[PDB]
Design a protein around this motif. Structure first.
Motif, PDB file in Angstrom:
ATOM      1  N   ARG A 162      -3.980  13.831   1.044  1.00 53.94           N
ATOM      2  CA  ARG A 162      -5.572  13.039   0.678  1.00 53.94           C
ATOM      3  C   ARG A 162      -4.976  11.667   0.278  1.00 53.94           C
ATOM      4  N   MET A 163      -4.751  10.917   1.194  1.00 52.46           N
ATOM      5  CA  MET A 163      -4.396   9.646   1.416  1.00 52.46           C
ATOM      6  C   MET A 163      -5.528   8.741   2.146  1.00 52.46           C
ATOM      7  SD  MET A 163      -0.331   9.104   0.910  1.00 52.46           S
ATOM      8  CE  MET A 163       0.340   8.136  -0.322  1.00 52.46           C
ATOM      9  N   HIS A 164      -5.976   7.653   1.666  1.00 55.23           N
ATOM     10  CA  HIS A 164      -6.894   7.017   2.727  1.00 55.23           C
ATOM     11  C   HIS A 164      -6.703   5.549   2.678  1.00 55.23           C
ATOM     12  N   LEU A 165      -6.690   4.937   3.965  1.00 55.46           N
ATOM     13  CA  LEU A 165      -6.518   3.498   3.847  1.00 55.46           C
ATOM     14  C   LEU A 165      -8.035   2.919   4.275  1.00 55.46           C
ATOM     15  CD1 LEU A 165      -3.009   3.549   5.545  1.00 55.46           C
ATOM     16  CD2 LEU A 165      -3.315   2.546   3.412  1.00 55.46           C
ATOM     17  N   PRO A 166      -8.498   1.822   3.708  1.00 56.68           N
ATOM     18  CA  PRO A 166      -9.884   1.493   3.864  1.00 56.68           C
ATOM     19  C   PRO A 166      -9.558   0.722   5.260  1.00 56.68           C
ATOM     20  CG  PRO A 166      -8.530   0.201   2.115  1.00 56.68           C
ATOM     21  CD  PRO A 166      -8.047   1.474   2.362  1.00 56.68           C
ATOM     22  N   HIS A 182       0.781  -1.311   0.023  1.00 58.11           N
ATOM     23  CA  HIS A 182      -0.124  -0.075   0.016  1.00 58.11           C
ATOM     24  C   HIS A 182       0.779   1.361  -0.044  1.00 58.11           C
ATOM     25  CE1 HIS A 182      -2.582  -3.119   1.631  1.00 58.11           C
ATOM     26  NE2 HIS A 182      -3.797  -2.459   1.537  1.00 58.11           N
ATOM     27  N   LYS A 183       2.014   1.294  -0.481  1.00 54.83           N
ATOM     28  CA  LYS A 183       3.000   2.467  -0.021  1.00 54.83           C
ATOM     29  C   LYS A 183       2.195   3.683  -0.892  1.00 54.83           C
ATOM     30  CE  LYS A 183       6.549   0.680  -2.267  1.00 54.83           C
ATOM     31  NZ  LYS A 183       7.816   0.119  -2.665  1.00 54.83           N
ATOM     32  N   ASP A 184       1.534   3.645  -1.847  1.00 54.98           N
ATOM     33  CA  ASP A 184       1.047   4.681  -2.582  1.00 54.98           C
ATOM     34  C   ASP A 184       0.041   5.362  -2.044  1.00 54.98           C
ATOM     35  OD1 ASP A 184       2.895   4.567  -4.933  1.00 54.98           O
ATOM     36  OD2 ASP A 184       1.760   3.036  -5.997  1.00 54.98           O
ATOM     37  N   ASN A 185      -0.592   4.523  -0.619  1.00 53.54           N
ATOM     38  CA  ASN A 185      -1.425   5.296  -0.076  1.00 53.54           C
ATOM     39  C   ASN A 185      -1.365   5.349   1.341  1.00 53.54           C
ATOM     40  OD1 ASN A 185      -3.831   4.941  -2.349  1.00 53.54           O
ATOM     41  ND2 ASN A 185      -4.652   5.871  -0.912  1.00 53.54           N
ATOM     42  N   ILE A 186       0.051   5.193   1.577  1.00 53.21           N
ATOM     43  CA  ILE A 186       0.553   5.259   2.977  1.00 53.21           C
ATOM     44  C   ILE A 186       1.149   6.662   3.434  1.00 53.21           C
ATOM     45  CG2 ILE A 186       2.027   4.629   4.523  1.00 53.21           C
ATOM     46  CD1 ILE A 186       1.726   1.787   3.751  1.00 53.21           C
ATOM     47  N   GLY A 187       0.145   7.619   4.133  1.00 59.48           N
ATOM     48  CA  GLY A 187       0.655   9.018   4.589  1.00 59.48           C
ATOM     49  C   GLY A 187       1.498   8.987   6.026  1.00 59.48           C
ATOM     50  N   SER A 188       2.037  10.045   5.962  1.00 64.73           N
ATOM     51  CA  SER A 188       2.886  10.422   7.119  1.00 64.73           C
ATOM     52  C   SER A 188       2.219  10.119   8.568  1.00 64.73           C
ATOM     53  CB  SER A 188       3.413  11.896   7.163  1.00 64.73           C
ATOM     54  OG  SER A 188       2.525  12.903   7.518  1.00 64.73           O
ATOM     55  N   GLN A 189       0.912  10.452   8.514  1.00 65.10           N
ATOM     56  CA  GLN A 189       0.171  10.092   9.842  1.00 65.10           C
ATOM     57  C   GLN A 189       0.051   8.882  10.393  1.00 65.10           C
ATOM     58  OE1 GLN A 189      -1.908  13.058  11.905  1.00 65.10           O
ATOM     59  NE2 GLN A 189      -0.649  11.306  13.060  1.00 65.10           N
ATOM     60  N   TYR A 190      -0.034   8.080   9.492  1.00 64.28           N
ATOM     61  CA  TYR A 190       0.027   6.312   9.577  1.00 64.28           C
ATOM     62  C   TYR A 190       1.383   6.042  10.330  1.00 64.28           C
ATOM     63  CZ  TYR A 190      -4.757   5.682   8.139  1.00 64.28           C
ATOM     64  OH  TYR A 190      -6.072   5.488   8.171  1.00 64.28           O
ATOM     65  N   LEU A 191       2.378   6.313   9.476  1.00 64.97           N
ATOM     66  CA  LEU A 191       3.719   6.047   9.881  1.00 64.97           C
ATOM     67  C   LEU A 191       4.121   6.474  11.168  1.00 64.97           C
ATOM     68  CD1 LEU A 191       5.283   6.613   6.354  1.00 64.97           C
ATOM     69  CD2 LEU A 191       4.934   4.284   7.268  1.00 64.97           C
ATOM     70  N   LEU A 192       3.898   7.583  11.564  1.00 60.67           N
ATOM     71  CA  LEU A 192       4.207   8.207  12.951  1.00 60.67           C
ATOM     72  C   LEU A 192       3.412   7.366  13.958  1.00 60.67           C
ATOM     73  CD1 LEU A 192       4.792  11.779  11.657  1.00 60.67           C
ATOM     74  CD2 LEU A 192       6.568  10.125  12.375  1.00 60.67           C
ATOM     75  N   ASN A 193       2.154   7.049  13.610  1.00 61.40           N
ATOM     76  CA  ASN A 193       1.410   6.369  14.690  1.00 61.40           C
ATOM     77  C   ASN A 193       1.850   4.702  14.868  1.00 61.40           C
ATOM     78  OD1 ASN A 193      -0.122   8.652  15.454  1.00 61.40           O
ATOM     79  ND2 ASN A 193      -1.641   8.179  13.986  1.00 61.40           N
ATOM     80  N   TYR A 209       7.274  16.290   9.749  1.00 60.66           N
ATOM     81  CA  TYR A 209       8.486  15.533   9.889  1.00 60.66           C
ATOM     82  C   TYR A 209       8.666  14.202   8.944  1.00 60.66           C
ATOM     83  CZ  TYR A 209       8.360  18.119  14.128  1.00 60.66           C
ATOM     84  OH  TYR A 209       8.049  19.298  15.220  1.00 60.66           O
ATOM     85  N   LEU A 210       7.556  14.039   8.396  1.00 64.37           N
ATOM     86  CA  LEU A 210       7.486  13.067   7.189  1.00 64.37           C
ATOM     87  C   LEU A 210       7.236  13.671   5.758  1.00 64.37           C
ATOM     88  CD1 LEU A 210       6.564   9.734   8.370  1.00 64.37           C
ATOM     89  CD2 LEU A 210       8.665  10.496   8.350  1.00 64.37           C
ATOM     90  N   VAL A 211       8.144  13.652   4.915  1.00 65.81           N
ATOM     91  CA  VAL A 211       7.327  14.600   3.580  1.00 65.81           C
ATOM     92  C   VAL A 211       7.167  13.521   2.333  1.00 65.81           C
ATOM     93  CG1 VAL A 211       7.993  16.579   2.088  1.00 65.81           C
ATOM     94  CG2 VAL A 211       9.396  16.061   4.307  1.00 65.81           C
ATOM     95  N   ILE A 212       5.824  13.397   2.387  1.00 66.44           N
ATOM     96  CA  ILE A 212       5.498  12.472   1.222  1.00 66.44           C
ATOM     97  C   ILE A 212       4.447  12.951   0.324  1.00 66.44           C
ATOM     98  CG2 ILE A 212       4.133  10.587   0.956  1.00 66.44           C
ATOM     99  CD1 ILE A 212       5.350  10.037   4.068  1.00 66.44           C
ATOM    100  N   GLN A 213       4.818  12.916  -1.156  1.00 68.88           N
ATOM    101  CA  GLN A 213       3.788  13.682  -1.954  1.00 68.88           C
ATOM    102  C   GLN A 213       2.421  13.036  -1.998  1.00 68.88           C
ATOM    103  N   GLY A 214       1.608  14.024  -1.744  1.00 66.24           N
ATOM    104  CA  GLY A 214       0.075  13.553  -1.771  1.00 66.24           C
ATOM    105  C   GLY A 214      -0.485  13.224  -0.465  1.00 66.24           C
TER     106      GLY A 214
END
Ligand SMILES: */C=C\C(=O)Nc1cc(Nc2nccc(-c3cn(C)c4ccccc34)n2)c(OC)cc1N(C)CCN(C)C
Length: 319
Positions: free
Chosen positions: A285-289, A110-121, A277-282
């Motif tokens: 607006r990334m959502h993980l179902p 899911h790397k293309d939908n994984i956002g900074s907020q998820y990774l830090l959590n 603290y994490l820079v990710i393009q897009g």
């Protein structure tokens, strides 16, 4: 000066549960997706079921009962929950099914939908897990993204307690060098702090979306690399703040490395301003179902009617 461990250990009837499917097959072991129904409880609980594959069947039963001993003794939202064991000829360990699988696999798919907020959590929940282990005086000794599981994209838990030890207790084939601390590699020393080093590697795997650490390099070389003072590279998406934390987990002096409770604080702070603290393009607006709520979602996962489904976390002993 250690307390009596009064955890209960529950023995499940082989009749009570069914194997729906094979989650994994390995030379070491095989694991099944299945469903567990206590007799007359009117509940169905999604479970994973594990049988080991040691050279001799008694030695297999030894390794897996130790794992059960550990899981039966821990109770924490970021540690994997044991339901019980089944006394078939080859012993069966029964734990909570984590429908999204291990983190390492999940981060790849899911790397293309994984956002900074998820990774830090995930990084916070993981340090919470380990800090809970530290309180229990438990050293995991095999922290890695393959051994973190996903109950939901919002909720991960540590797993693989087969190698776990009490700190300083008396305990060598197919050890995972890449995740290992240097003192661990040179002198078979292991500590919470040694665990912290592994946390570093684990974090890197997440920030690289599943890259293999020290890719293309033989394990024999690794001890020497680390002795020179080389470390793992800064992931592209990683501000220096984050990378710095990794590098501290990889100091030679183990008392120098951070403490899991300090890691909680630090990653918890960045989770308040994730894109700082994490820079990710897009990223925005990334959502993980997360169809945890739907019964239908469950029905698909285990292929049955699911009105009386209950997740282990809502299923508490006393029975
Ligand atoms: C990293 C592989 C993986 O975990 N894959 C996986 C896992 C689950 N859910 C689950 N839940 C509880 C326990 C386990 C588990 C524990 N151990 C030691 C395992 C070894 C091998 C496989 C699973 C193990 N797993 C899952 O639930 C749907 C699916 C799943 N996937 C994605 C299967 C395909 N992978 C191998 C990529």
């Amino acid at each position: 000066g250690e307390a009596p461990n009064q955890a209960l250990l529950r023995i499940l009837k082989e009749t009570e549960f069914k194997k729906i499917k094979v989650l994994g097959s390995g030379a070491f072991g095989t694991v099944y997706k299945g469903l567990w129904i206590p007799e007359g409880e009117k509940v169905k609980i999604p479970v994973a079921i594990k049988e080991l594959r040691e050279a001799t069947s008694p030695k297999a039963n030894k390794e897996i009962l130790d794992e059960a001993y550990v899981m039966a003794s821990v109770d924490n939202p970021h540690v994997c929950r044991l339901l019980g064991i089944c006394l078939t000829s080859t012993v069966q360990l029964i734990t909570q099914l984590m429908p999204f699988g291990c983190l390492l696999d999940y981060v790849r798919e899911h790397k293309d939908n994984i956002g900074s907020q998820y990774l830090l959590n995930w990084c916070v929940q993981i340090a919470k897990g380990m800090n809970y282990l530290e309180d229990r005086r438990l050293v995991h000794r095999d922290l890695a993204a393959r051994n973190v599981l996903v109950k939901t994209p919002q909720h991960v838990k540590i797993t693989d307690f087969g190698r776990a030890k009490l700190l300083g207790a008396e305990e060598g084939g197919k050890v995972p060098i890449k995740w290992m601390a240097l003192e661990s590699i040179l002198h078979r020393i292991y500590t919470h702090q040694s665990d912290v080093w592994s946390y570093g590697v684990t974090v890197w795997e997440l920030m690289t979306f599943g890259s293999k650490p020290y890719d293309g390099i033989p394990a024999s070389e690794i001890s020497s690399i680390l002795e020179k003072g080389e470390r793992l590279p800064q992931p592209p998406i990683c501000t220096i703040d984050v990378y710095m934390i990794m590098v501290k987990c990889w100091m030679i002096d183990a008392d120098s490395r951070p403490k899991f409770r300090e890691l909680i604080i630090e990653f918890s702070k960045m989770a308040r301003d994730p894109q700082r603290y994490l820079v990710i393009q897009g990223d925005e607006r990334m959502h993980l179902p997360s169809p945890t709520d739907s019964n239908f979602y469950r029905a698909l996962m285990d292929e049955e009617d699911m009105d009386d489904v209950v997740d282990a976390d809502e299923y508490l002993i006393p029975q």
